[PDB]
């Protein structure tokens, strides 16, 4: 057993202590007798014997002597398995550089020595010298030279200085430096130069030096002098059938190293010239680099078939490395697969399994059972009995599979309902039989799909397959709490045909005694299923304490509903079957049956519904013919009446009355209108066109047309497809996105042209090609979500906070899109909310809001509840059960030990394949309410407001907000506040291409703040004669003029600036360029007059950008702190802006380009967070200025905006889990005796539990800021290197973990999957807990 995993650098002595001897030559094996040659790469004296308990010569054998070492051949007598464990080594004749610690950016050598990469890569190729010692001279350490300057220094200084070349120089540099002294001298000499640009690199270098000092490594071990050699059985040399051999590539890469090292050991004995020894050292360096990482430092060495050779680093990383191919998913025994087909007679817990598959998968069970009954003497006779297929084998098989579940699985597995457990029923034939009700969780059908079969072997696996995964526990969805077993295609059609009615049906009028008599009359041929009758019916209810009370009546109904009522269980009202049922009504039936009665009645009721639907669909006789597609008789005239209009709109273009663009854009809509007319004529001629007469004469009723019947019931189809069957097809797009002019005026019942067919193929291929190239983006997103969320598990029962989040309905974009009931069902209340009076307590203030509480909330009217959330949980390393709420697939409080992260990721990722990739009116009557407002009366008897960010709400009968808008700034409110206005009434009027900005108070306007020669012209409208000093563009700019940006201001009878009530305010605002102002000089105005005006992607990409926390390319600018705004020093790179607190310091001022139109004038007072411009907001700013709840709310609303637009239902805590995982890091601002640095990035939980102990015994803690990382940057920044290494970028993760000296504690799920242990979630949660208790014991 073990508890952790470590990683570090390896010294030469460590590499020599792993090995069993030195490899000295490239010999692999002998060419006549294929035996391993001595001292080569497959040597049997170093690496172990090639047969069990035999030496190589043949002298020793037979397991008598087990530890002897033969004296002839040196092989020891032992088992050959040891050729997978023993290593060797190679002693290099000159040191070489490890390529990982040199060329993985940032380089660790260049960061440790503070040298550029160019200088090092020049000293390493014998191309320049480097000074190691200065002696007493002008030259200093790490100075770079050339040959001539080296000769000059030699003949001038002589012996005192020291200069070298190659990896020996760099090893001497790394070996001589002192780390503690250097880091401490980086400490006190940073505070002066703690400027940011130097701050980042200085603190990075400081933490690197400190890591080397504390970890125990030495900086010179990054230069190799001894090399290890992998065991032979992991790089084998193997014969094929035919005498041919096959080999690994590491052999090819090791031979080059060995026989370039031997040549250098020769040249160093012949005492050759240095121009040749240098070439050898370069070649040795290149060979070792290609053995470690092939294509990194140059061209890739290729083999004799012109493909690059694979290296030690390509066997670990990538989609086909060890991690993703052999450790996170494997191939398994006891498994099979086959084609699936439907069996409609099965129960919900049953599957049909062929006899031959089951005989193969269950062989050891059958052998043991056979030799227990004495039917066979030994296992080898049992084998032949089974192989002959005697008759008793088939009777042993039937009692082996009795009460043995079997797991079925279909790929791709998008969520956990892709694997389910069944009980097998032996069949003849070769295809597997599946129940018709589970094909919706699998996404399966019978056009050729195939499924896989797995057999659990042990007692615990059988218990878990029965209790957790059996198909009769999985009726609800885990994403939303809805049922998943709804009936799809012919259950629906049969139940809909049996509960319809008809006029003048045979047997109309009778009075019957009960359902049994209606059935007996239908079977006999006396009544019809659609006949209107009167039946006596008994129904039950429960208002007693768990008991049922009955009551009988006479009801008016049809025969078919009375027949169906014999299926419904006791305790449901009759009004559920008295409709004409469709898919929605049947789903309602199943859901109310689950809410009232429970699980087992529901799983019996679903089966009964399926059987009776199939039976009556069969008896109906529904078919499809060519006459069932009815084309309306007035299409041929709508078409001509559109063609005449397009002709008479072409001839207004041939005579120069209309442009080409408007001509096209008018033909488009005069064809769209005719298409809509045709479609509505078609649909009205088809839907109720039945004239069936009655006892005296004719009347109308709904149609019994087959196509209409299967479209209207929800079995198969829609209106958009009958439109193409019987209407016209419509308008087609080019592959560009442009729409062709002439539409397709034909349908499929009539037949297309060559040309209409040709132009219809474009969109078909475009859709088919988008599907295949979207599935990859969806899968990659799911994998990143699973990797960020995998280690989050419900750990505790109650953390005890009072925090929460405020849930209200969403009413924007129109009507109420999401009620309050759908957003609090299941959550736990954060505070003791009270119905809209005072002290209307419903709560112990921890209350699981089940359906009765939601009904109580809706019989009153409350529209805001404070609830609990995971992004505010106080538990570290997990969540508590009360902050999470309800288990959405079980219907009760979540259990402690549940893996909520994998469920969140799977629920968000599964639907990703369906994503696409001038005046205010009021509807209904209610009060009008305003917020965030500041008002003034107008000159024309109306309301105006001087607020930019106000909100206008509509109040209902009881005071629940039904609609909410916001008005543009400067707009004039047509009517005031507190009004009960009816619908159809406008409340505010704004211009569609303009917005005015108004004065403050009635005063006297003066033309000031502008001269002639300024950004002002004297441009007067020559035809009408109205002009103020008008503000200009930058094309008419006079740079010397913009000394003061023009604005016409308001003065008193004093000639000076007007009072503003409440504060000594300047009454007038200076406006940016190109302003339209035509207000007269000398013609004064009143308060609120027109002084100036303002002239003027969804799908998977947006979801990925939200979770990755991208930054928009036009981000809005917000107020850093609260203060009075003004323009700053005006350094004209581009504009400068400052704000000033009324009490505090104001060193903060920064840059704004003049393209960015400002909406805050020099007299404004802003609070923290409000906008200074418009544009999409950036989430890091929302987290810095406003808190955590603001960025949570923004992210969840912007994500749900995309899913709701398509009809996809996902609960909202599944996004809160991801948002919690993106917020795990904190950054330190002021340490204060906290053992942390001053701008280091730490885990948030470490800071929290450090400050909770410092503050415990009376000390000052640390101060910090929160951070927001994307999902792939937060997956890689976790504190376990095995999860990060197995996710992505294995090279960077492993080099950084190696030089840092990290360790791993195996706390997530993936760490325990890699080493084959029980995960800490589920039925394995208790086990780990007990182990953790022993961690406190020792």
């Amino acid at each position: 057993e073990f508890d952790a995993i470590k990683i570090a650098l390896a010294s030469p002595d460590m590499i020599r202590s792993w090995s069993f001897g030195e490899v000295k030559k490239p010999e692999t094996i002998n060419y006549r007798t294929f035996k391993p040659e001595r001292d080569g790469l497959f040597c049997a004296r170093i690496f172990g014997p090639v047969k069990d308990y035999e030496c190589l010569c043949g002298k020793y054998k037979r397991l008598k002597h087990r530890g002897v070492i033969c004296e002839k051949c040196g092989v020891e007598v032992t088992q050959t398995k040891v050729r997978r464990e023993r290593m060797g080594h190679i002693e290099l004749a000159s040191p070489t550089a490890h390529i990982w610690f040199l060329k993985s950016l940032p380089s660790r050598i260049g960061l440790l020595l503070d040298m550029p990469l160019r200088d090092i890569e020049r000293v390493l190729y014998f191309e320049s010298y480097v000074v190691i010692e200065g002696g007493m001279t002008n030259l200093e350490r790490q100075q770079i030279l050339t040959e001539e300057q080296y000769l000059d220094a030699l003949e001038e200084f002589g012996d005192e200085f020291d200069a070298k070349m190659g990896a020996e120089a760099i090893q001497a540099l790394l070996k001589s430096m002192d780390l503690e002294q250097e880091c401490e001298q980086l400490r006190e000499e940073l505070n002066e130069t703690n400027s940011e640009t130097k701050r980042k690199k200085l603190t990075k270098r400081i933490k690197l030096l400190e890591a080397f000092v504390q970890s125990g490594n030495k900086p010179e071990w990054m230069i190799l002098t001894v090399l290890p050699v992998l065991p032979p059985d992991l790089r084998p040399l193997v014969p094929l059938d035919g005498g041919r051999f096959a080999t690994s590539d590491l052999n090819d890469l090791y031979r080059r190293v060995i026989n370039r090292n031997n040549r250098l050991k020769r040249l160093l004995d012949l005492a050759a010239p240095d121009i040749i020894v240098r070439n050898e050292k370069r070649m040795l360096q290149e060979a070792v680099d290609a053995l470690l990482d092939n294509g990194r430092r140059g061209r890739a060495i290729t083999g004799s078939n012109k493909r690059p050779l694979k290296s030690l680093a390509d066997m670990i990383k990538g989609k086909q490395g060890r991690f993703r191919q052999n450790l996170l998913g494997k191939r398994v025994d006891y498994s099979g697969r086959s084609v699936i087909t439907v069996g409609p007679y099965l129960r919900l817990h049953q599957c049909g399994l062929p006899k031959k598959m089951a005989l193969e998968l269950f062989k050891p069970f059958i052998y043991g059972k056979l030799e227990l009954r004495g039917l066979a003497t030994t296992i080898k006779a049992a084998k032949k009995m089974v192989e002959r297929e005697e008759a008793v084998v088939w009777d042993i098989l039937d009692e082996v599979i009795r009460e043995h579940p079997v797991l079925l699985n279909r790929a791709p597995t998008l969520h956990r309902l892709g694997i389910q457990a069944f009980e097998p029923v032996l069949i003849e034939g070769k295809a597997i039989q599946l129940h018709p009700l589970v094909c919706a969780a699998y996404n399966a059908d019978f056009d050729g799909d195939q499924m896989a079969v797995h057999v659990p072997l042990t007692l615990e696996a059988q218990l878990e397959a029965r209790a957790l995964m059996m198909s009769t526990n999985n009726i609800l969805s885990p994403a939303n709490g809805e049922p998943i077993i709804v009936p799809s295609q012919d259950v629906v059609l049969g139940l809909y045909y049996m509960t319809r009615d008809c006029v003048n049906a045979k047997g109309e009028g009778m009075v019957l005694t009960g359902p049994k008599e209606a059935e007996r009359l239908y079977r006999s041929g006396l009544a019809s299923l659609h006949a209107r009758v009167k039946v006596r019916i008994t129904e039950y209810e429960k208002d007693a304490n768990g008991e049922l009370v009955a009551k009988t009546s006479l009801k008016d109904t049809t025969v078919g509903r009375a027949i169906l009522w014999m299926i419904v269980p006791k305790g449901l009202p009759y009004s559920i079957v008295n409709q004409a049922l469709g898919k929605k009504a049947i789903s309602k039936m199943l859901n109310t049956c689950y809410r009232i009665l429970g699980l087992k009645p529901t799983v019996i009721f679903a089966d009964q519904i399926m059987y009776t639907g199939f039976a009556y669909a069969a008896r109906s006789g529904a078919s499809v013919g060519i006459d069932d597609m009815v084309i309306p008789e007035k299409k041929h005239e709508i078409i001509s009446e559109a063609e005449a209009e397009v002709a008479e709109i072409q001839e207004q273009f041939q005579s120069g009355l209309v442009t080409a663009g408007e001509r096209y854009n008018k033909v488009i809509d005069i064809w769209a209108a005719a298409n809509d007319r045709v479609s509505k004529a078609m649909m009205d001629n088809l839907q109720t066109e039945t004239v069936i007469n009655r006892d005296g004469q004719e009347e109308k009723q709904v149609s019994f047309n087959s196509i209409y019947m299967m479209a209207d019931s929800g079995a198969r189809g829609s209106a958009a497809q009958i439109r193409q069957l019987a209407g016209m097809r419509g308008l087609m797009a080019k592959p560009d996105g442009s729409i062709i002019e002439t539409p397709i005026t034909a349908n499929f019942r009539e037949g297309l042209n060559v040309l209409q067919y040709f132009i219809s193929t474009h969109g078909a291929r475009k859709g088919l090609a988008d599907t295949a190239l979207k599935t990859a983006n969806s899968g990659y997103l799911t994998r990143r979500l699973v990797d960020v969320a995998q280690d989050l598990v419900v750990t505790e029962d109650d953390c005890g906070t009072h925090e929460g989040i405020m849930m209200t309905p969403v009413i924007e974009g129109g009507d109420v899109k999401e009620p309050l009931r759908d957003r609090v069902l299941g959550r736990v209340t954060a505070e003791d909310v009270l119905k809209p009076g005072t002290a209307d307590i419903l709560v112990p203030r921890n209350t699981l809001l089940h359906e009765q509480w939601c009904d109580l909330l809706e019989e009153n009217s409350v529209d805001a509840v404070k609830v609990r959330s995971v992004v505010s949980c106080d538990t570290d390393f997990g969540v508590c059960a009360h902050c999470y709420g309800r288990d959405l697939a079980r219907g009760h409080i979540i259990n402690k030990g549940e893996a909520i992260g994998v469920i969140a990721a799977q629920s968000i990722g599964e639907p990703g394949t369906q994503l696409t990739m001038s005046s205010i009116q009021v509807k209904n009557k209610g009060s009008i309410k305003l917020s965030n407002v500041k008002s003034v009366v107008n000159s024309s008897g109306k309301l105006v407001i001087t607020s930019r960010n106000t909100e206008l709400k509509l109040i209902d009968e009881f005071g629940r907000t039904k609609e909410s808008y916001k008005v543009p700034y400067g707009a004039v409110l047509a009517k005031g506040d507190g009004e009960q206005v009816a619908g159809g009434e406008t409340v505010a009027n704004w211009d569609p291409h303009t917005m005015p900005v108004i004065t403050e108070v009635s005063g006297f306007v003066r033309f000031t703040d502008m001269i002639d020669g300024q950004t002002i012209t004297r441009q007067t409208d020559e035809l009408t004669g109205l002009s103020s000093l008008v503000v200009l563009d930058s094309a008419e700019r006079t740079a010397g003029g913009k000394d003061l940006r023009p604005a016409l201001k308001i003065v008193d009878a004093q000639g000076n600036d007007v009072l503003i009530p409440g504060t000594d305010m300047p009454a007038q605002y200076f406006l940016p360029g190109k302003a339209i102002v035509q207000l007269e000089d000398g013609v004064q105005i009143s308060s609120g007059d027109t002084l100036a005006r303002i002239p003027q992607t969804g799908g998977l990409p947006r979801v990925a950008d939200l979770f990755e926390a991208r930054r928009p390319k036009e981000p809005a600018i917000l107020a850093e702190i609260s203060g009075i705004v003004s323009f700053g020093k005006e350094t004209k790179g581009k504009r400068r802006l400052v704000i000033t607190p009324v009490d505090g310091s104001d060193p903060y001022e920064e840059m704004i380009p003049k393209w960015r139109q400002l909406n805050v004038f020099e007299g404004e007072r802003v609070e923290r967070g409000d906008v200074i411009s418009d544009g999409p907001e950036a989430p890091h700013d929302i987290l810095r200025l406003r808190g955590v709840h603001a960025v949570t709310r923004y992210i969840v609303n912007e994500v749900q905006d995309v899913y709701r637009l398509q009809g996809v239902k996902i609960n909202d805590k599944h996004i809160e889990v991801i948002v919690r995982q993106m917020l795990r890091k904190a950054t330190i601002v002021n340490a204060g005796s906290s053992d942390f640095l001053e701008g280091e990035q730490v885990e948030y939980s470490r800071v929290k539990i450090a400050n909770r102990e410092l503050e415990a015994n009376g000390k000052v803690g640390a101060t910090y800021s929160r951070d927001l990382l994307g999902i792939t940057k937060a997956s890689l920044a976790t504190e376990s290197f095995i999860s990060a290494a197995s996710f992505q970028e294995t090279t960077r993760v492993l080099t950084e973990a190696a030089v840092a000296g990290k360790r791993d504690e195996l706390r997530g799920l993936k760490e325990n999957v890699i080493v084959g242990r029980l995960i800490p979630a589920g039925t394995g949660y208790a086990y780990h807990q007990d182990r953790m208790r022993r961690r406190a014991a020792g």
Binding site: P26, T28, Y125, E127, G243, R263, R278, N279, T378
Partner: protein, 465 residues
Amino acid sequence: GRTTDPVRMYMREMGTVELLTREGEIDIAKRIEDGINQVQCSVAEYPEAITYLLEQYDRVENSIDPELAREKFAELRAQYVVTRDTIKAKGRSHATAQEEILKLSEVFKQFRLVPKQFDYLVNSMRVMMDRVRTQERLIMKLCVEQCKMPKKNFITLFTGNETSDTWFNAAIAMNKPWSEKLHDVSEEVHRALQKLQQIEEETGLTIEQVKDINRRMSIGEAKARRAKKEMVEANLRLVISIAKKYTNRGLQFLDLIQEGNIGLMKAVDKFEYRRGYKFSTYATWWIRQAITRSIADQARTIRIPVHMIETINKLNRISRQMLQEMGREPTPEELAERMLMPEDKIRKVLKIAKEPISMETPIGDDEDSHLGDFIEDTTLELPLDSATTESLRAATHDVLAGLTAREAKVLRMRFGIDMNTDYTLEEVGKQFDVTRERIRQIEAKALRKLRHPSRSEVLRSFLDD
């Protein structure tokens, strides 16, 4: 330098040298030759501790007359026995000695390039000279631990005087307390210095004449080395022009170049300018030899010996011309009839010329399925066989309990069941002191009972193998 290619980095550092003319190589070879004889001169008058040729001419005891081979060795020693009689006169550096031993050098200059014979005489002093060096290192690792003292007076007068320890009297002369701060250890200095003085006894000569003329003997061994270096460095384009016709045969370009350079370094060592030929004509042989020898030794995963390489090459050359002549490929019969070898050997050769396939070879339409995925482990035992082995062990253990304990111990010892080894009759009767024959008797008893049908049909169930 804006490049990382090592072939360009080589061809650039190689181009800063100039090609030689016919006179340049001759007068370079001349100084190569005369430095190596300046050395042999310097070796002449060293004392008898050298391995001097007194009887090397007798140690060994173009076909030269025996009377010529016996006589001309008598000139040199006939003068030498009377010349070095003056080893005593006026110390060791007498001028008649220099004059007539450089006249022995006038005699010595006649000779030219020779095998390591000459080497093994200068090694005669190697094993003796560095010895002297290392011994005066010993004294130093015995002085610095006890006292510190300025080295450039001590070792200077050490180089100079070498008469006796009287130069230590030059240490107290400056009157500083580091003079005799040494205590009780100077006899270790005298230990090592006295042992090197008995080395001086066996040599009979002081060190500052031996090392004196070793300073000038080292001049020759370096002046030959430098000229060899610049004779090598001026001909690298020859190697590069030869080695470009061996590409695509299992080695890379720079490997062929670095193999050719080791042959050029031998052609430079064996040259003789007197024979009148150019350097290219003699060097090309050694260059091609080195490259050809390295292609046949490396460049195959499974290595083939040289004779098999030449057999393969000859068979290829024959089949080429038979294919050109017949228009088809010849069967091994038509190759055996012309190669004149037994047909079974022609069949044996044709299997040895195949290189192993890579385990990354893409097999299918895609490139995610490789050859190495479908390779099965063949050394594993099936679980039916494991279960059978264990069941048979249990069955035998049950049948071995019926008969006597002493009569089953002998079967356990005889077949090795439950024991570390099998045994023989005499070593089993060792512990039973039973005769050679009674063991066989009781074994024919046990094996006769164990096949009686009351017992056998439990074990018979297994023998259907």
